[PDB]
Write a protein that binds this ligand. Sequence first.
Ligand SMILES: *Cc1[nH]c(Cc2[nH]cc(CCC(=O)O)c2CC(=O)O)c(CCC(=O)O)c1CC(=O)O
Length: 324
Amino acid sequence: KMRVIRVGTRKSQLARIQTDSVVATLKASYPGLQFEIIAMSSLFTKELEHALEKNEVDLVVHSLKDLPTVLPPGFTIGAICKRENPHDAVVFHPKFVGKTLETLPEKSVVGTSSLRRAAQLQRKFPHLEFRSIRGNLNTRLRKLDEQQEFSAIILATAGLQRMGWHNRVGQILHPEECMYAVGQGALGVEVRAKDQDILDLVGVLHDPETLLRCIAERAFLRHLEGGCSVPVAVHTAMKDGQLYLTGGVWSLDGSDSIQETMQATIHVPAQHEDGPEDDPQLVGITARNIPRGPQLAAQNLGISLANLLLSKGAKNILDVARQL
Ligand SMILES: *Cc1[nH]c(Cc2[nH]cc(CCC(=O)O)c2CC(=O)O)c(CCC(=O)O)c1CC(=O)O
């Protein structure tokens, strides 16, 4: 009568690397336990979810920014892992290595299929062109270097780092240039919402500071009626007992913009707990072993900033962008 922890992965390289980093952390906490990785084949979220409900697998690893602020019923995010670098990065064509976006020749084409990235970068760099680029990270790096269309592309720093492409990171974008997506750089572990055994085990992965930052960022996004699909961006930081949250929305061209910052006293809790089970998820995340007070406070900060943005016309900016 054995028990093996079954871990679902997409077989794509980056998804597989993320899965292994999490399994490695679990093995270190649970050396006496057995894990089995089950390769399978954004439809991919659906099918890995399908295997979870069909009980073919026990946990799957996502980039947090790829999960929506409300998960389908019967699933939850049981762990938010310690955040890697959240910043967007510029990769340059070999001809332009050493340059910045500030020093590219006028009318260079920058590749990105993110509405958030294009809107912010258009606003700050009027003399540049931004055009859609499709594919995974290696395919985008290929189309940048071999085809002569693009002079640069935008990618998450975290993804390049995980892929072993740290050296192609040419410039790391600051918040004044491009704020990042909600939950960028953090990994989220999705599990069956009722599965207390697996929820127990993966709970060891929660990093308190990352969990609180991502609750505030996801609550901001959810209250604005947003997902991966909208031109919304954020910056969070925890220092000296303060949780800072900057949030922004943009027209698809970046000409219209509301951006404000708010803060609150949330101390990063050092202790673990065994909170009650009937405590519901917060923005899709189950963290019963972290003190709940700081979580609720982070959720309120997100909501407060969304309300401030909405009172300055955010819903109009977002509804106008969506219809295009
Ligand atoms: C919301 C969104 N997801 C992606 C594709 C994606 N998802 C995860 C990563 C790696 C970074 C991480 O784990 O946080 C990536 C790739 C990347 O952002 O570099 C995108 C990118 C669409 C595109 O520009 O082609 C987005 C949109 C967004 O970030 O706003």
